[PDB]
Design a protein around this nucleic acid. Structure first.
Ligand SMILES: [Mg+2]
Ligand SMILES: [Mg+2]
Ligand SMILES: [Mg+2]
Ligand SMILES: [Mg+2]
Ligand SMILES: [Mg+2]
Ligand SMILES: [Mg+2]
Lengths: 138, 99, 208, 150, 125
RNA sequence: AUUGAAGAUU
RNA sequence: UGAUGA
RNA sequence: AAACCGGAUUAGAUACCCGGGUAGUCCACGCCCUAAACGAUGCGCGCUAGGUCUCUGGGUCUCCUGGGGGCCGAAGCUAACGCGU
RNA sequence: ACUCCUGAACCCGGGACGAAACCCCCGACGAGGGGACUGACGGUACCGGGGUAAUAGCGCCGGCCAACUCCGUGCCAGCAGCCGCGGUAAUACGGAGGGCGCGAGCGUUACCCGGAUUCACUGGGCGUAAAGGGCGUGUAGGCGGCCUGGGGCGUCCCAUGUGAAAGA
């Protein structure tokens, strides 16, 4: 049935970038969108937009890389080095504000969902609230 | 404050008494996952009033018997025989577990 | 406690001059002039290429052997230094350097640490006037370290304190030569000490 | 001139008609203690030419180690085969608390405060190779910023 | 295992076994001898090794090694036992403490004197 | 006696 | 079809 | 064709080879519940280059497009061997 | 060794705090003021004077692991935490010189945690290393696509009570 849609997205994304695709559809959900917004803003993706395919709502995700590279193996560095689900249907994961993780001494993000909406970790910390720890990303 | 618990009536087979199944759920100390867990309470129903399938509040009470220690505070909703159904089948699984 | 045995003899082995005698370890030997090599039947056969361990060992040996404080006591001071706030390698140095017996010597009242230690045990020293006979005594900043007026007479106190008339003293210390007394101004900054010793390696010896 | 420490020498052996035939392998690190290290694996009929040969390959294989005062930008774990290394940043005063293999490598990039763990297979060669890959993999605030601007 | 699985069964504590029923934990036990046989080692080892059968205050009767140059033990000898296998002699897992009870210390012993149980001798000392 | 030394062999 | 222990 | 009865072979031959032979192999009904019961690879779903052979549908039938069976092998994975829509 | 110097012990002299209340007197049996008795530790601690060069042991030195040489011994006697030493040249046995380590201690044995991501939540695996159930059906249970609204149980936040002393 597809059991964790948000896992899915992270994975679709993880997969498309390692073969350096320009873009990936992922079937669209409001929540998925909210996570994408962060990705976009935090400068991990170029951007994203709604689209249809076979006339059902998707989300094209435009991915983003580094420059062509030095010697044998000219593959660009990845912008999204690591994108990992934390909370999962098997095991939900929640943090109080005092215990939100700091991803790769701040060079990374942790999307995290609160009752004040979906936020990066600094975002959440600032508005002094915690919630479901969605994924890390660096 | 006298504890208030809310559950499902799964037995009226006793005079002035009801058995109430109260589910509780929480994060498992080591393994994290939110796990369910429940307990039946025998509660005081003096006007043999609440019946099989009612959802009720249960309130911490001055003792009535050995094991009667709660009284039926009120009714939340009637009908919920699915919940009783759940309990009953789980109960009958038990035969199909010995020798 | 404390060592007691052949000495300008590790002025040796540890590879480098420790002035443990002081008075002589200054003049055609810390024993170390005549034979700059390890002791015993084997000490001048070809150096064995020493292990990462060996190295760390000797280095702490070196440092400790300088203040002649015992392993038990040394270790306690180190653990003290670890858990304390700030850069643990240094602080440890500050702390060893705060031992009365060492300070008595840094002030020149004696010519060595082992000799200095005796003057402390034998009542010849005061701290802020009140007498103190503990080598291990922790000197804090602002403390005045006197010769005991009763002891001010002996051929030794004379000779050593006279010897100091010309002499310069620790940036972190002060010493009024005439009135036979010193002040402990501040604990020494790593830079103030010139110890033949890489402390980061000592820290490393107390890892595994 | 960089610094050069020998992490490992071993004697391997192959078989031929009547008798075995020995060889020597040498793991050598070279570093300027200022954010530049190299690993070198050199093998030869004799220890010296081997060690020496390592030296040569070490200098031909070098890394940007972005020190940030004694320590590294952030945490990394790297797997190399069954070998795994974790590298952790530390405030000054700590030291290089590592195993002999990555200590050697960290020390010669002039890392002075780092917390490490060897996990998985502890085989020196691969631990050393992971360590290098780990360092080779460190980014800094700057690089990230460049990457994400677009 | 899945996490549900760990919730269901959990991990299992690796709780492991003594090598030395000198029973009640006890760091030493007192026994009385029975045989003072000699035994051949195994492996690639050849020699005539000293052993006693010891009947213990544990209730237990077992074989123990008699360490050092030469002993003075026989049938009714009465001895303290310490644990320490022999490793060349499978089924020998306890040593006899030398210098306790009816076990003489090792005569003429200069070096590791503390084991073997022999007093500081007097010569030029 | 033999073996590097033994077991075995006169 | 066999080739005593290290 | 186990067993077993003989014939050879062999140092011997409770075996390999040869001549016989009962259970069994076959059927019905009831048991047994095992295996190198193997892809030594649990089941479902989503994602990630291609080439070529093949079974079986559909299309506008060079081909395109489903569902099986194969091999080679992007990225990747693996201790390696390998695995690889 | 030997020169000088200091002076643990030991001797002499002094000598505690710990104890100001109960009580009595004044006041008023109050408040407040005055007064007296009382020390097991103990002639101890501590202070002053005098003053003797005055105890060193245990473990270890093949590798891991810091520290090497000569005899003896000849798969013996023995060592041995694991790997392993000893078969006539033993840095591995026993002794000795020397050496390393710790020091009024040093070693041994037993037991607990560590290292052991070797029960793996943090943090493991199952083609050939140990590990896919012989295969299905489907009970409990676990898990559950996209949109909107209620509720607010989980979850998150603020305040507040609680979390004794010891310990840290
Ligand atoms: Mg792996
Ligand atoms: Mg392993
Ligand atoms: Mg054979
Ligand atoms: Mg042998
Ligand atoms: Mg495993
Ligand atoms: Mg298997």
């Amino acid at each position: 049935m597809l059991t964790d849609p948000i896992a899915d997205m992270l994975t679709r994304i993880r997969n498309a970038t390692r073969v350096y695709k320009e873009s990936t559809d992922v079937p669209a959900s409001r929540f998925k969108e909210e996570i994408l917004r962060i990705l976009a803003r935090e400068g991990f993706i170029k951007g994203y937009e709604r689209v249809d395919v076979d006339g059902k709502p998707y989300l094209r995700v435009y991915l983003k890389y580094g420059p062509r590279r030095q010697g044998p193996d000219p593959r660009p560095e990845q912008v999204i080095h690591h994108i990992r689900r934390i909370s999962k249907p098997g095991r939900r994961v929640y943090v109080g504000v005092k215990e939100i993780p700091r991803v790769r001494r701040g060079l990374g993000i942790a999307i995290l969902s609160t009752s004040k909406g979906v936020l990066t970790d600094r975002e959440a910390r600032k508005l002094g609230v915690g919630g479901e720890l969605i994924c890390e990303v660096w | 404050p006298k504890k208030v618990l809310t559950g499902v009536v799964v037995s009226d087979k006793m005079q002035k008494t009801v058995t109430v199944l109260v589910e509780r759920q929480f994060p498992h100390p080591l393994y994290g996952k939110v796990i369910k867990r429940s307990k039946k309470y025998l509660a005081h129903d003096p006007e043999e009033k609440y019946k099989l399938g009612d959802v009720v509040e249960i309130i911490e009470s001055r003792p009535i018997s050995k094991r009667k220690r709660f009284r039926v505070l009120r009714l939340v909703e009637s009908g919920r025989m699915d919940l009783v159904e759940k309990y009953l089948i789980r109960r009958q699984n038990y035969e199909s577990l010995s020798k | 406690g404390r060592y007691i045995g052949p000495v300008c003899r590790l002025c040796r082995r540890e590879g480098v001059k420790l002035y443990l005698k002081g008075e002589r370890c200054y003049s055609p030997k810390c024993a170390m002039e005549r034979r700059p090599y390890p002791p015993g039947q084997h000490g001048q056969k070809r150096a064995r290429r020493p292990s990462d361990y060996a190295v760390r060992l000797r280095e702490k040996q070196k440092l400790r052997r300088i203040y002649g404080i015992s392993e038990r006591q040394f270790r306690n001071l180190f653990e003290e230094a670890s858990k304390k706030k700030g850069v643990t390698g240094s602080v440890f140095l500050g702390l060893l350097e705060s031992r009365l017996d060492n300070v008595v010597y840094r002030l020149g009242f004696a010519v060595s640490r082992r000799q200095a230690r005796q003057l402390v045990r034998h009542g010849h020293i005061t701290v802020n006037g009140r007498r103190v006979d503990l080598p291990s005594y922790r000197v804090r900043p602002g403390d005045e370290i006197a010769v005991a007026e009763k002891s001010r007479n002996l051929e030794l106190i004379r000779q050593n304190l006279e010897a100091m008339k010309g002499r310069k003293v620790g940036p972190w210390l002060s010493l009024d030569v005439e009135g036979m007394k010193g002040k402990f101004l501040r604990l020494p900054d790593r830079e103030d000490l010139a110890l033949p010793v890489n402390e980061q390696l000592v820290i490393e010896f107390y890892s595994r | 001139d960089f610094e050069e420490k020998m992490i490992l020498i071993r004697r391997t052996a192959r078989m031929q008609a009547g008798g075995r035939r020995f060889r020597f392998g040498a793991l050598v690190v070279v570093g300027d203690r200022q954010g530049r290290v190299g690993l070198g694996f050199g093998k030869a009929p004799e220890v010296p030419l081997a060690v020496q040969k390592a030296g040569y390959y070490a200098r031909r294989n070098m890394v940007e180690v972005p020190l940030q005062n004694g320590t590294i930008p952030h945490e990394i774990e790297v797997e190399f085969g069954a070998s795994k290394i974790v590298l952790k940043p530390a405030a000054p005063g700590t030291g290089v608390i590592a195993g002999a293999v990555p200590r050697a490598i960290l020390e010669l990039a002039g890392v002075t405060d780092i917390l490490t763990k060897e996990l998985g297979s502890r085989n020196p060669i691969n631990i050393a190779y992971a360590t290098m890959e780990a360092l080779r993999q460190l980014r800094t605030k700057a690089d990230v910023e460049r990457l994400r601007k677009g | 295992p899945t996490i549900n699985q760990l919730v269901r069964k959990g991990r299992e504590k690796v709780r492991k076994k003594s090598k030395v029923p000198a029973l009640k934990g006890a760091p030493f036990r007192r026994g009385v001898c029975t045989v003072v046989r000699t035994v051949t080692p195994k492996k690639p080892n050849s020699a005539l090794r000293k052993v006693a059968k010891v009947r213990l205050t544990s209730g237990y009767e077992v074989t123990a090694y008699i360490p050092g140059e030469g002993h003075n033990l026989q049938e009714h000898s009465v001895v303290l036992i310490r644990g320490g296998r022999v490793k060349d002699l499978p089924g020998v897992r306890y040593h006899i403490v030398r210098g306790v009870y009816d076990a003489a210390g090792v005569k003429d012993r200069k070096k590791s004197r503390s084991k073997y149980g022999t007093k500081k001798p007097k010569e030029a000392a």
